[PDB]
Amino acid sequence: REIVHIQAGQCGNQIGAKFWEVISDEHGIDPTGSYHGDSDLQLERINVYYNEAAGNKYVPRAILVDLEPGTMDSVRSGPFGQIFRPDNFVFGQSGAGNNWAKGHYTEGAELVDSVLDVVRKESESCDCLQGFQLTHSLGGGTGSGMGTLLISKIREEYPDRIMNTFSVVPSPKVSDTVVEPYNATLSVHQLVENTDETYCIDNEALYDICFRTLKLTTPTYGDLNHLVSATMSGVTTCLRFPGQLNADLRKLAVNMVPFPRLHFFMPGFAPLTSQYRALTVPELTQQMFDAKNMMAACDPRHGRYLTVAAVFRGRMSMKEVDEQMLNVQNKNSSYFVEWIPNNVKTAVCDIPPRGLKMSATFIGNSTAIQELFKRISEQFTAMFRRKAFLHWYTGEGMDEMEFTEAESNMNDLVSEYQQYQDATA
Amino acid sequence: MRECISIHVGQAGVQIGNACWELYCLEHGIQPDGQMPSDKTIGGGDDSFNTFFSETGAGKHVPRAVFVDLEPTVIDEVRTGTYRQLFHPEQLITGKEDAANNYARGHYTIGKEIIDLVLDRIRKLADQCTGLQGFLVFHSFGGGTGSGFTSLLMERLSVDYGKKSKLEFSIYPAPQVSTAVVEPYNSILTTHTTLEHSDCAFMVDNEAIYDICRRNLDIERPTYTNLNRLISQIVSSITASLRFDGALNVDLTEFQTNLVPYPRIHFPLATYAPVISAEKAYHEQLSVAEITNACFEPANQMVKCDPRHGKYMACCLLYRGDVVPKDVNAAIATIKTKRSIQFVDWCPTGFKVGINYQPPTVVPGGDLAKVQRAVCMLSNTTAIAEAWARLDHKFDLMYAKRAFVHWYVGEGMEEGEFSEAREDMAALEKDYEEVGVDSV
Numbered sequence A: 001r002e003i004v005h006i007q008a009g010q011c012g013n014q015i016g017a018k019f020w021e022v023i024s025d026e027h028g029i030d031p032t033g034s035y036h037g038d039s040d041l042q043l044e045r046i047n048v049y050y051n052e053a054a055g056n057k058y059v060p061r062a063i064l065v066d067l068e069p070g071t072m073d074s075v076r077s078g079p080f081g082q083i084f085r086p087d088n089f090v091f092g093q094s095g096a097g098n099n100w101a102k103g104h105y106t107e108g109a110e111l112v113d114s115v116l117d118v119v120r121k122e123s124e125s126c127d128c129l130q131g132f133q134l135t136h137s138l139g140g141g142t143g144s145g146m147g148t149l150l151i152s153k154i155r156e157e158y159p160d161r162i163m164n165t166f167s168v169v170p171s172p173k174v175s176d177t178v179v180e181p182y183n184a185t186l187s188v189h190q191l192v193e194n195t196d197e198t199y200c201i202d203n204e205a206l207y208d209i210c211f212r213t214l215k216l217t218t219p220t221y222g223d224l225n226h227l228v229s230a231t232m233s234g235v236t237t238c239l240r241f242p243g244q245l246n247a248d249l250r251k252l253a254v255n256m257v258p259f260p261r262l263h264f265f266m267p268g269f270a271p272l273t274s275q276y277r278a279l280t281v282p283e284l285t286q287q288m289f290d291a292k293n294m295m296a297a298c299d300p301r302h303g304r305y306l307t308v309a310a311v312f313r314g315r316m317s318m319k320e321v322d323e324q325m326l327n328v329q330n331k332n333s334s335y336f337v338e339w340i341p342n343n344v345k346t347a348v349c350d351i352p353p354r355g356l357k358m359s360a361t362f363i364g365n366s367t368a369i370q371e372l373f374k375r376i377s378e379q380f381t382a383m384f385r386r387k388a389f390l391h392w393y394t395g396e397g398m399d400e401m402e403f404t405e406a407e408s409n410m411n412d413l414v415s416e417y418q419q420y421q422d423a424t425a
Numbered sequence B: 001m002r003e004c005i006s007i008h009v010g011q012a013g014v015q016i017g018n019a020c021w022e023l024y025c026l027e028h029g030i031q032p033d034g035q036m037p038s039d040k041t042i043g044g045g046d047d048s049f050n051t052f053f054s055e056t057g058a059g060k061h062v063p064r065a066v067f068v069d070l071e072p073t074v075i076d077e078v079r080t081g082t083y084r085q086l087f088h089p090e091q092l093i094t095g096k097e098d099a100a101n102n103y104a105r106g107h108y109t110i111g112k113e114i115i116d117l118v119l120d121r122i123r124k125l126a127d128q129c130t131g132l133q134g135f136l137v138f139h140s141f142g143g144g145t146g147s148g149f150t151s152l153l154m155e156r157l158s159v160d161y162g163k164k165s166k167l168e169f170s171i172y173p174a175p176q177v178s179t180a181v182v183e184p185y186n187s188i189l190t191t192h193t194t195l196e197h198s199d200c201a202f203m204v205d206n207e208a209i210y211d212i213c214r215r216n217l218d219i220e221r222p223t224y225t226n227l228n229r230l231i232s233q234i235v236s237s238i239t240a241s242l243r244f245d246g247a248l249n250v251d252l253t254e255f256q257t258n259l260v261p262y263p264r265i266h267f268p269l270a271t272y273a274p275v276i277s278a279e280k281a282y283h284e285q286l287s288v289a290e291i292t293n294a295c296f297e298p299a300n301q302m303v304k305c306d307p308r309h310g311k312y313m314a315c316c317l318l319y320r321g322d323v324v325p326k327d328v329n330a331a332i333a334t335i336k337t338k339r340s341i342q343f344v345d346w347c348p349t350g351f352k353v354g355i356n357y358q359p360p361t362v363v364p365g366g367d368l369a370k371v372q373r374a375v376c377m378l379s380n381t382t383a384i385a386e387a388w389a390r391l392d393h394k395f396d397l398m399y400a401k402r403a404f405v406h407w408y409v410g411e412g413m414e415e416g417e418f419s420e421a422r423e424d425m426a427a428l429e430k431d432y433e434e435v436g437v438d439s440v
C-alpha cells in the first residue's frame, strides 16, 4: 500500500517540502536519505511514502511540479532538497501568472504529459498502489489550474484509485492577487467531482491563528506552513505508524464520506505552537473541538457534523481520552447528526510529533464548511456581475458560460450542505 | 530569462532613456565601459539584472535597448557621450529629417522609410533572448516622432510578436515646456492608434514633474535634465521588480493583473516619494509611515488629477530599501482611517505590496538626496480621466476651426482619422465613467 505524492505550484511545493521535512524527522531519515533512528516502529511503514533505493537509502515517492523554476530551485537548495529523486522535478519556464486558464488549458496542458510520465514510473514500482495525495493552492494558476488538470488526467489512467488533496483556500486577508476568487471557484468544481477527500486549509484561519492566538504581529507564509505541515503529519499518522488500526485510504474514505460530493473536511490541531507545560487530556479534547483550532474559517456551531475523527499522539490514558471524548459529545450533542450513529472516531498513536509530549489532530466533515464556499462565491459574484478581470481568461480561450457553470455548481454544493444541515431523523 | 527590450522613440524617449540607463548602471555597479566587476559569470548568466542587460564574452554588459529618432542630433549626443561604449552602434538608429511635430510625418511620410530597419534591429535583440517577456516603449505624446512613429511601431510589433506584452512610458504635454500648439492633435491620434496595442501605459505629466522639481527640490526653473532624472527614479521603482530579486519582491506582472480590470482601462496613476533635496534631507530621515502618507498627497502624483473625487480600482505599493512588512502594515492602517480612499463596489479594497531591499541610488551631482527607503504607488483610479478631458477639450477648440489641420492633410491624412480618434477618446472617457458607477 504505497502512496504517490504530488505538489504543484508555489504554495503546493512549499507546504509539501515542510511536510517531507516533518515526517522525515519522525521516521528518522536524514537530509541525505540515510536512517539514523532508534526504534523499528519508524520503518515498519516507511514504504508507504518512501522507496528503498540502492545503499539502504530512502527516497520520497513524491513528484514536484511547477510552471516556473523559481520555487523548485529553492526546494532543491532547501534543508531537505537533496532527498527528492532528481528526475521527479518537472517544471516549465513561462509560468501561469496566477491564471487558472493558463494552468488548466494552455501552459499547463503543454507540460501535463511530462508529469504523468513520472507518475507512471512511480506507480509501476508500487507493489499495490493505494492512491494519490496532492498539495496545492486554489488561488494561483499552476497549483489551481494545472493541479486540477493533473487530477482529471490521473482519474483517467487510474480510475479505481483514491485521489485526495490538501487544498489551501484563498482569503483577502492573505492575498497575492484579486482574481483569486475566480481561480478558486473554477478549481472547487473540479474537486467536487474528482477527489475523494479534500482537506480545506483556509489561509484566513491560519492568519487569525498566528495573529490572535499565537500573538504573532507579522505572520509570514512560513508561519502558516508550520501549522499546515503539523496537521498533515497528524492526518497521515494513522497510515505512517503501526497501531492496531488497519487503515487504508479507501477504508478511511468509506467511513468519512456519506455522500460523494460532500467530502470537504475541516482540519484541526492542538496544542497550537510556534511552551513546556504538559497539556492535559481534557485540555487536548476541549481545544481540538474549539473553533479557534480549526484550519477552515467556519464556525462548527453554525452547522452539524456528519462524521468526525480525532487522532491523539503520545503516551496517555487511552481510558481518559474515551471519557473526555465521550464527555465532549454531550457538550455539543446537538451539533452531531443523529441519523449516522456512532459517527465519531478516535485513534491513538504512541509516537509524538517533534517537541511535543502530546498532540491531537482533528478531522471533521461538517456542513458548516458551507460557510467557506459562500465566502468565495460572494467574492466571485462581486466581480463577475461586472465581468471584471475576465479578459485575463477570455484571452486564453475560455467562454463566460464556463464561469457561470462553475458558479452554479458551487451554489449547488452550498445548497446540498444546507439540506443535510436541517435534516433530522 | 524573461528579458525585456526597451525602445526609446523621439527626443523625449531618448533623453529619458539616457537618464534611465545611467541610473540602471549605477544601481547594478556597471561602469560606462560596460564592465561589471561583481559579475563572475562571464559572457552570460541568469541573474536578475540580465533581464535588462546582455553579456559579451569580453565582459561587456549591453542594454537590451533600441534608440530611434527621425533626426540625429539627440542620438548623436549619445554616440559621443559618457555612455557611448555601452551601446553597440547598431542599437542607435537615426533618420535625417524629423516629423516637424506632425503625427502624419512620423506615422506615414517619414516613418515609412525607416520602420523596416528598426524592426530588423529589434529582431536582432529578440533573437538573443531565451524567454522574452515584452517591450518597454518610451516616447512623448506631443512630438511628431514620439506620437506618429510610436503608433506605427506598436502596430507593427503586434503583428511580429502577437500579444507579447508591450508597456508604455508616455510624456503628457504641459504648456510650461510644450513648445508646440499641435501637441493635443498628436496626443489624441496616438492614444487612439495604440490603445488596442498597449497592455499597460504609465503616463507622466510634465507639469506634475515640473511642479515637483520646483516645490520639493527648490529649482527655480527646472530643465529636461531635472525632469528626466526624477522620471528615471519612478521608472526604476517600477522596473526594480524585474532587475532585482528577493523574498518580498513582487513581479510587475503580478501587479499588472490587479491594475487592469478591462483591457482599455490600463492607465495606472503613479505617485512617488520622497523627493527631497540634500539640504532638507540632512538630519531628517523619513520613516516608512511618512513616505507612505506622501503617496496620497496629490502634489506627488505623476499626473495632475484628484483621486479624492474619483474611485479606486486597485492600489499597489512598491517599496525599495530599508522597509519591512510590519512598518508597512502599520502605516497602511493609519492611512485607511484618515483619508478618502473609496473603491468601486466590484473590487476588493486591499493593497498589494512589494519590497526591494536594494536601496535607492542617485546620480552624482544631481538634486535628489540619497535616501534609505522610497516608495512608488501604482493606482487604478477613475480620476486619471481628467487628463483625457483636459486634452480632449483643447483638441475640440482647434478642430472646430480645422486649425492646423492642413499640415496633416498635406501629408496624406484624412479628416476622418481625426473624428475617428476623437470619438474613441469620447468612448474612453465614458468607459471610465461606467466603471465607477455602483452595481445593481
Ligand SMILES: Nc1nc2c(ncn2[C@@H]2O[C@H](COP(=O)(O)OP(=O)(O)OP(=O)(O)O)[C@@H](O)[C@H]2O)c(=O)[nH]1
Pocket: B009, B010, B011, B012, B015, B016, B070, B098, B099, B100, B101, B102, B140, B142, B143, B144, B145, B146, B147, B171, B172, B173, B174, B177, B178, B179, B180, B183, B206, B224, B225, B227, B228
Ligand atoms: N519629460 C520630457 N519631455 C520632453 C523632453 N523632450 C521633449 N519632450 C516633450 O516632447 C514634446 C516636443 O516634441 P518632441 O519630443 O521634440 O518630438 P519628437 O518625439 O522628438 O519628434 P519630432 O516631432 O520630430 O520633434 C513636448 O511636449 C515636450 O514636453 C524631455 O527631455 N523630457
Ligand SMILES: Nc1nc2c(ncn2[C@@H]2O[C@H](COP(=O)(O)OP(=O)(O)O)[C@@H](O)[C@H]2O)c(=O)[nH]1
Pocket: A008, A009, A010, A011, A012, A014, A096, A097, A098, A137, A138, A139, A140, A141, A142, A143, A144, A168, A169, A170, A171, A174, A175, A176, A177, A180, A203, A221, A222, A224, A225
Ligand atoms: N500557506 C501558504 N499559502 C500560499 C503560499 N504562497 C501562496 N499561497 C496562497 O496561494 C495564492 C497565490 O497562489 P500561488 O502560490 O502563486 O499559485 P501558483 O502560481 O500555482 O504557485 C495566495 O492567495 C496565497 O493565499 C505559501 O507559501 N503558504
Ligand SMILES: COc1cccc(-c2cc(NCc3ccc4[nH]ccc4c3)nc(N)n2)c1
Pocket: A133, A164, A165, A166, A197, A235, A236, A237, A238, A239, A245, A247, A252, A253, A255, A256, A309, A310, A311, A345, A347, A363
Ligand atoms: C489525504 O490523504 C490521507 C493520508 C493519510 C490519512 C488520511 C486520513 C486520515 C484520517 N484520520 C484517521 C482515522 C479516521 C477515521 C477512522 N476510522 C477508522 C480508523 C480511522 C482513522 N481520516 C481520513 N479520512 N483520511 C488521508
Ligand SMILES: [Ca+2]
Pocket: A110
Ligand atoms: Ca508554448
Ligand SMILES: [Ca+2]
Pocket: A113, A114
Ligand atoms: Ca506522452
Ligand SMILES: [Ca+2]
Pocket: B039, B041, B042, B044, B045, B046, B047, B050, B055
Ligand atoms: Ca551573469
Ligand SMILES: [Mg+2]
Pocket: A010, A140, A176
Ligand atoms: Mg505566486
Ligand SMILES: [Mg+2]
Pocket: B010, B011, B069, B071, B098, B143, B145
Ligand atoms: Mg525630434
